[PDB]
C-alpha cells in the first residue's frame, strides 16, 4: 500500500520488463506475482 | 600577532564540556583540568566553539611542575581540520577558580600553535559563583606604571555567553524549567528587580574591602582600578540640577498613561460581569421549564 | 487549562506530516480505490475506518 | 568541503527589515531571515 | 530493480577527461593514464571510457564503467541501468526499441 | 529465548546532544558519520556518554564510511585523557529526511551488531529539529531468527510501554522486517542546567539598565492611539449584538479575533512596563545618591 | 505483628490450643477457601474469546489476558486457566512467560496443604527448561503463602544465599528476581532482620531485575517498622546506584517502610522530593501516602497537591494523584471534588493518575459520583487514560450485579466491545481485559474491602496491595499484588463446640434476584 | 513554542479555500497542492479569499 500506476512498454525475455511511470524517471523492473509476461501484454497498465 | 580579543562569545558546548572533562580525569583538591579550546581567532570577536581535554598533570608540591604532552596537541590538530577547518587552536581552558602566576608560563607554550595571544578561559566547574560561570583573561606584556618593571600579566577582556544557532536547538530542549530569570511577565521582573539590587550591592561591597587592604595590609597599588573609581565619583547624579527635576516630572508622565489604561480595563472586566449575569438570567428560566415539561412527559406514559 | 491545552494541540497537528487531495475515479476489487491525486500521478489506496 | 556551497535567489520583495521574500533558483519562493553579518542597507528589492 | 534508466550521450574517455587537475591539464592527461605518473602522494585513477549519461528527469552525471559487464559492450547511443542514487552502470540495456521495428 | 531482545532506553547526555547538532548543521546538505561511545549496563540500559564525529565521507554513509585510520587514532586519543568509553553504536544523518534506515544503513547496523549486539543506530536531522526532542529516534535490531518464526515482538515487556511513533513511509517498513524504535531519554544533572541558566552577570545588570527615554515615550505614544482605534473596533462589536445564536454573532460582528481580548493585552503590556520603568528609576535615585 | 506477640503470651500463660490456632490464622484461611470451593462460577467463554482476540503471539497481549484470568479463578485451585489456555501458554516467550507462571500463584492462593505440592513441578530441581518458569514459581509460591507461612520463608532464604554468590549469569538473575519478591510477601510484617541481610546482598549485586525485586521485598518485611538503619541504607544506595529499575523500587520500598509513621516520616519526605532524580520524587509521593494514610493531616494533602502541579516531570505528576486517594482513603466521598480539575487536565499523565486515584479510593464500596467523573475518562483519546479508566471503574463497583446498579451493565459491555474490535490500541486492550478480570474475580463473591467494618479499622495488608498494583507500567507483572486487597465477603456460621461449619438458613430482608450472580458473556454460535 | 514555527524559515504557498475552519487547502510554490491545518488566532476574516 499504496500502489502506483505504471505502464508496460516491453518485456525482456529473462522475466523482466521495461516500464514507464507517471513520474518523470523510467525504470527497469522485475515481473513478479501471479501476473506473468504470458498473462501480460505490452501497452497494458499495470500495478507497481 | 594581534591584541584583538575584545569580545568573547562562548558556546554552551564549552561550559558543559569543561564540567564533563574534570570528571573524566577526576582532578580534585586544586588539581586542574587543562585542555584546549578551539574556535576562530585573529579577530575582534572570538567565538569559543569547542573544547577537548589534553594529557595533563598538576603538582601541588611546586606549581612550576606540571606535565604536558606536546605530541597530543600536534596529533589533535590533524584530526580537527578534517571535521571542520573553521576550528583551530585559539588557546586553553583552565578549571580555576584561582588564577596563578605559573599559568603565564603554561601560556607561553600555547603561543606556539596560534599567532594571536592565547586565550585562557577560566571555567569554574565547582559552581561557587552564582554569576560569572565564564571569566576570560588574555596574557599581554606591558611596562606597568609607578616605577614598576615590565610585567607579563593577565588582563580581563569582556566575555558573554551568546550560543551558536546550531547549539540553540538543544539549549531549548534541555531547558524545561520555569526560569526564575528569563525576563517574562510583571511577576518575573519584580523578582528580578530585587535580585538585581542585591547583585550590585555585593559587587559594591568587594570594592570597599579591597580599598581597605591597600593601606592596611599593604596590597600593591594597581592604579587601573583606582582610575576607574575617579570616574565613579564623576558620574554620580547630583540633585538640584534641572535634570533630576525633569526626571520626577517624567515619573508622573508615565504614571499618567498607566492610569488611562487601568480605567480602560475596568470597563472590560465589568463587560465580563454583565455577560455572565445575562446567561444566569436565562438559566433561571430553563431550569423553571423542566418542572413544567415533566408533567407533559408523565402524561404520555399513562396514555400510550 | 482550556487555553494552554489548545495552543499545544494545534502545534501537535503542525509537527505531524502533510496531506494531499485526490478525487476518486473508480473502485477496485481489493477494497481500494483508484484516486487521481490532483497535483501528481495516480495512486491506488486503501479505504479509511470511517469510509 | 567544509565551507559548502550556497543557494542563489533574488529579493522578490521586501517583507520586513528582518524578513525577505526571495525567489530561489532551485524552485520555491521563501521567507528568509537576515544574518547579523549582512546589513539591511545592502538589502533592497530586485538585488541578487 | 529499480535501476533508473539513462542513456549514453557522450563517450568522454577516462584518461582524456582529466579527473586529476593538480599536475594534469584539462585537454588530456596522458591519453592512457591520469595519475599513474603520480605515485609521489598515492592517488589512483585511470579507467577507460566513463561515459556521460542523461537521466529521464534530464540530469547528467559521469557514471561508472559496467560492474556486471565489460565496457566493450557499452557504447554511444546505448541505454543503460544505473543505481537509485549510486549512479553506476551494473547492467546495460539494449540500444533503444529499434529491433523488430526496422525489420518489418 | 537466548537474547532478551527488548529495546534499550537510550540515555543521551547533554554534551552528546549538543555535539551531534553542531556537526550535523555545519554539514547540510550532506550526510555525516560518527561513532557513539558509552557504557552499557543492565539488560536494556545504554548510556551514551559521548560521541565523536567521523570526518565527512566522499561516498556518503555506507559500510566503508569509517576509515580505520581515523577510528583507531581517535579512540587512542580518548585513552590518553581517560575519557575512554566503548563503541556501543553509531550515528548517521539523513539531512533532509526524518528518521529511518535506508537499505545501506540497515546493512551498516548488521556490521555494528557483530561488534556489539545491543548496538544503537541514531538518526539525527540537524535542520528539522527546532524543538530538539523531535527527529532523533534510536533503533536497535531485533534478531533474525526472531523474525521468521514470529517471535518478533518482545520489546513491549520490560519498558514503560509508552511508545511514540509516526509515519508509514520507509520508517514503518524498516520496523516490520528488521528493527524496533524507542524514544530518546535525556539525562542530566543540575550542574549542566546551572551553566545554561547563567549567561554572564550582564543578565541581572540589565534589570537596573534603563534605555533611552526617547524610546519609552515612543512606545507609550503608539499604544495610546492603538487602544483608541481598537476601542472603536470594540464599539462596532456592541453595536447591537443581541441577535440569535452565539456563532453567527462571532462571524458577523468580528467576535472571532476578538477586539475585547485585543484591548486587554495592549493595556496590560504597557501598564506593567511603565511599572518597572518607574520602579527602576526610583531605585536608581535612592541607591546612587 | 499484633497476632504474633499475642500467640506467644497466651501459650506462655497457658491457654486452650483452639484460640491459639485461630490467631495463627489457619482456620480463617480454610473457611474462606471452602466458601470459594462451594460457590465459584467459572466462565470458560470469557477465556476463549479473551484468548482469541488477544493472542499470545503478541507479548503485551499475553500479559493482559494472563493477569485477568488469574484473578478470574482466584483463591481456589482450578484447571480452567491451565486447560483452556494450554496452546496459548506455550505461545508465550520472554517475560510474558514469567508472568504466566506467577499467574498460577493467584489461582492457587490458600489451600495451604496443597500449596507446596501444586507449584512443585515448576520449581528449581524439577524444572530444567525456561528460566522464566524457574523464576515465576518462587514468586507464585510467595503469593500463596503471603502473610501466612514462616516455613516458606526459609526455603526461599536458602535459594537467595545460593543465587546471590552468582550474578554473572542471566539465568541466575531471572531465578533470583522471583525468590526475592516471594520472600517479601511470605514474611510481610514479620520485621525479621535475617530477611533484610539476605536480600541486601541481592540489592548489592547491581542486578537489573533482582535489585528492584529485592528493594520491594525488603520493605514488605520491614512494613511500618521506621527502623533508622533501613531508612539510611536504601536512600543512600539510590544515589550510588544509577540503574533506573533498582532506584524506582528502593523509592517505593522506602514508602513501604515508613507506612503509619506520620510526622516522624516528615524528615524522610523532605529529602525525597528535594532529590533531582525523577524516581525519588515518584516514591516521595507514596511516602506521604502511606505515612499519613486514612488520617487527616494538613501537611499531607497540601504537599501532594503542590507536587502534582508544579513539577517539571510527568511521572511525578501521575504518582501524586494516586497518592492523594491513599491520604483521603477514609474520606472517600470527597475525592471527586478535588480531582475534577485533575480529570479536566491538559496533562495525559495527570489524567492517568486521576482515574487510578478514584479506583483505589472509592474501591471499597459503590460511589456513583466517581463513575460520573470517570465516564469522560473512559472515552478520553489518550490511550493510557483509557487503560486507567477501564481498570478503575470495576474496583469501585466490585462484584455487584448488572441489575442492582445499571451502571455496571454499561461498564461490562464497554470492556467487551473493546476486546471485539482490533482497531483499538494495545494499551486500551490491556486495561479492558484486565478490568473484566477485576469485575469477575473469585468466582463472583469477592469484594475489595479497604477496612474491616466490625471495628472500622484499616487492614494492613490491602493498602500495600494497591501501591504495587497501581505500578505496572514499568514492570508489567506487579498486577498480582491485588490479591491482598480482595477479601471474600460472606457470613460463615461456626460451631463453638466442634469448630465445624453448620448448614442452616437465615432471614434476610432483600430482593429475590437483585443480589443473584451476573449473567454470561458468551454468544458466537448464534451466527 | 508556536511563535518559532510562525517565524522564519518559511516557504510561501497560496490559500485557495477552506474545507473546514481548521483544515484549508493550499498550493505550494514547490508545486505541490497540499491540504494543511490552520493555526488558530490567525485572521480568518481575510484568510477565506
From Swiss-Prot, chain B:
Name recorded for this polypeptide: 26S proteasome regulatory subunit RPN8
Purpose of the protein: Acts as a regulatory subunit of the 26S proteasome which is involved in the ATP-dependent degradation of ubiquitinated proteins.
Residue intervals of the MPN domain: 8-143
Origin: domain of life: Eukaryota
Keywords recorded for this protein, A-Z: Acetylation, Phosphoprotein, Proteasome
Organism: Saccharomyces cerevisiae (strain ATCC 204508 / S288c) (Baker's yeast)
InterPro entries: EIF3F/CSN6-like_C (IPR024969), JAMM/MPN+_dom (IPR000555), MPN (IPR037518), MPN_RPN7_8 (IPR033858)
Modification after translation: N-acetylated by NAT1.
Other facts noted in the record for this chain: Present with 19800 molecules/cell in log phase SD medium.
Gene Ontology BP term (one): ubiquitin-dependent protein catabolic process
Molecular-function GO terms, alphabetical: metallopeptidase activity
Residues the record lists as N-acetylserine modifications: 2
GO cellular component terms listed in the entry, alphabetical order: proteasome complex; proteasome regulatory particle, lid subcomplex; proteasome storage granule
UniProt record similarity statement: Belongs to the peptidase M67A family.
From Swiss-Prot, chain D:
Domain of life: Eukaryota
Protein modification: N-acetylated by NAT1.
Coiled coil: none
Family statement drawn from the similarity comment of this UniProt entry: Belongs to the AAA ATPase family.
Function in brief: The 26S proteasome is involved in the ATP-dependent degradation of ubiquitinated proteins. The regulatory (or ATPase) complex confers ATP dependency and substrate specificity to the 26S complex.
The protein's name in its UniProt record: 26S proteasome subunit RPT4
Source organism phylogeny: Eukaryota, Fungi, Dikarya, Ascomycota, Saccharomycotina
Span covered, complete protein: 98 to 145 of 437
UniProtKB/Swiss-Prot annotation, chain G:
Covalent S-S links between cysteines: none
GO cellular component term, pick one: proteasome complex
Protein's UniProt keywords contain Calcium: no
One BP term from GO: proteasome assembly
Key words of the record: Acetylation, Phosphoprotein, Proteasome, Repeat
PC repeat windows: 99-132, 136-173, 178-212, 213-247, 249-282, 283-318, 319-351, 353-387, 388-425, 431-467
Post-translational events: N-acetylated by NAT1.
Origin superkingdom: Eukaryota
UniProt GO MF annotations: enzyme regulator activity; ubiquitin protein ligase binding
Keyword Nucleotide-binding among UniProt keywords: no
Stated role: Acts as a regulatory subunit of the 26S proteasome which is involved in the ATP-dependent degradation of ubiquitinated proteins.
Family named by the database record: Belongs to the proteasome subunit S1 family.
Summary of subunit composition and partner proteins: Interacts with UBR1.
Other observations noted: Present with 4750 molecules/cell in log phase SD medium.
Protein name: 26S proteasome regulatory subunit RPN2
Organism: Saccharomyces cerevisiae (strain ATCC 204508 / S288c) (Baker's yeast)
Region of the whole protein represented: 268 to 794 of 945
Curated annotation (Swiss-Prot), chain H:
Record's subcellular location: Cytoplasm; Nucleus
Entry PTM: N-acetylated by NAT3.
Domain of life: Eukaryota
Role according to the record: The 26S proteasome is involved in the ATP-dependent degradation of ubiquitinated proteins. The regulatory (or ATPase) complex confers ATP dependency and substrate specificity to the 26S complex.
Similarity section: Belongs to the AAA ATPase family.
Protein name per its UniProtKB record: 26S proteasome regulatory subunit 6B homolog
Gene source species: Saccharomyces cerevisiae (strain ATCC 204508 / S288c) (Baker's yeast)
Gene: RPT3
Section of the entire sequence shown: 85 to 133 of 428
